[PDB]
């Protein structure tokens, strides 16, 4: 392996030699430089004008090793910045890599899959350009087998990852017919036993559901919700994360779409999610809760039935502030859409004190959200003649002192809502 630690100059020398073997070893030397951890000299390789050469090498059917070496080299260049990815595309790599997907050498088709994943991963324009060149059909053909388990683990992982990049990004979202075409294969990958394939399949589904309800509907109608819910309960954090994101995405949609998440048993996992030691899981889970409490009354009722109100009190009592912010949103939504009975239950679970404590916060929006919530709870207290008991409760936990101080707040939505609450209930 005397292709170790070459200069760029020597690589250029060998590549310009018109000796295919000399080209092969110089290309391998480039692969090695480009596959090093510390500052691989991507720009120096680009400046030397090597990309068109590498691309031409992809087409050398008669010399498989150089196809492999250049595929690897181009992969690592395309993994760089957008400008570096663009240089690979500008050299015509896209159709060349797509032709390689049909190679008889698995390590070469795999390397093409990888490279296309890096190009598509750059953003929506390159994603859509890879689609226009017709990548999807030969990619899906690689997975047209009776049992995915007969495929090499690394190979299957690379294919899944690349497919997820075709599902990825917005402005614009991927073409509808593309998504339609990829979906049945994704649904199948979502049922595979490998933790990495599972994660990346979940990421893919998370991307597709990040948008307008019509995108969400395409996914929901495939029947993947129960499987997403199952994956929500996995032990592996890299599976739970994209599974939770996808579920969160779906409940931003219609009441009907939100009902399928509930019907699939999602709420039963929330006691763990809302107490998860990973901050981002707890925050995402609480956000999802807030969008569920923005649903119908019967859906608020299922939140109650699953014992999730005390978990919301817990999150409101102690959590990362951004999670507490989502919890406040969850409560205001609850108190806006809930019945009198459901609102009363909330107080009985102890919502008032941690609510009042967050009034000291240095964020204007959560103050607004909270003041709205207590306003809604008073409006429920009226229909019971028990507004007096609530005033005292709020006075006792030091809440009234907090609301008085808000009458002289910078913001105006704030100082009004405060004084408003004061003159109606505390006078």
């Amino acid at each position: 392996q005397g292709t170790v630690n070459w200069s760029v100059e020597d690589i250029v020398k060998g590549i310009n030699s018109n000796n295919l073997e000399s080209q092969l070893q110089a290309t391998q030397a480039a692969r090695k430089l480009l596959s090093r951890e510390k500052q691989p000299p991507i720009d120096n390789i680009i400046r030397a004008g090597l990309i068109p050469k590498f691309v031409s090498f992809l087409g050398k059917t008669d010399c498989s090793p150089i196809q492999f070496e250049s595929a690897w080299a181009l992969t690592n260049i395309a993994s760089g910045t957008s400008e570096q990815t663009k240089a690979v595309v500008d050299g015509g790599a896209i159709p060349a890599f797509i032709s390689l997907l049909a190679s008889p050498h698995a390590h070469i088709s795999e390397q093409a899959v990888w490279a296309l994943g890096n190009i598509a991963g750059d953003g929506s324009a390159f994603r859509d350009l890879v689609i226009k060149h017709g990548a999807i059909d030969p990619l899906l053909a690689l997975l047209a087998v009776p049992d995915l388990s007969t495929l090499a683990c690394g190979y299957l992982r690379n294919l899944t990852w690349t497919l997820s990049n075709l599902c990825r990004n917005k402005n614009p979202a991927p073409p509808l017919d593309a998504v339609e075409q990829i979906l049945p294969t994704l649904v199948r990958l979502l049922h595979h036993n490998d933790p990495e394939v599972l994660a990346d399949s979940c990421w893919a589904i998370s991307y597709l559901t990040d948008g307008p309800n019509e995108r969400i509907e395409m996914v929901v109608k495939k029947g993947v919700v129960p499987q997403l819910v199952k994956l929500l309960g996995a032990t592996e954090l890299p599976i739970v994360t994209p599974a939770l994101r996808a579920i969160g995405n779906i409940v931003t949609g219609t009441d009907e779409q939100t009902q399928k998440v509930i019907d699939a048993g999602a709420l039963a996992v929330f006691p763990s999610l809302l107490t998860n030691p990973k901050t981002n899981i707890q925050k995402e889970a609480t956000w999802t809760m807030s969008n569920i409490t923005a649903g119908r009354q019967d859906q608020i009722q299922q939140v109650v039935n699953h014992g999730l109100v005390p978990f919301l009190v817990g999150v409101l009592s102690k959590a990362d502030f951004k999670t507490q912010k989502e919890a406040a949103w969850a409560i205001t939504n609850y108190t806006s859409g809930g019945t009198v009975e459901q609102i009363v239950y909330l107080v009985h679970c102890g919502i008032i004190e941690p609510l009042m404590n967050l009034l000291s916060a240095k964020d204007t929006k959560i103050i607004q959200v909270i003041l709205d919530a207590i306003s809604n709870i008073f409006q429920a207290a009226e229909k019971l003649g028990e507004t007096e008991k609530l005033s005292i409760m709020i006075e006792e936990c030091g809440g009234l002192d907090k609301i008085e101080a808000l009458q002289r707040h910078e913001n105006e939505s704030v100082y009004k809502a405060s004084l408003n609450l004061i003159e109606k209930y505390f006078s």
Partner: peptide
Amino acid sequence: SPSKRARP
């Protein structure tokens, strides 16, 4: 529906 929020 109108009270659904996007991820911030």
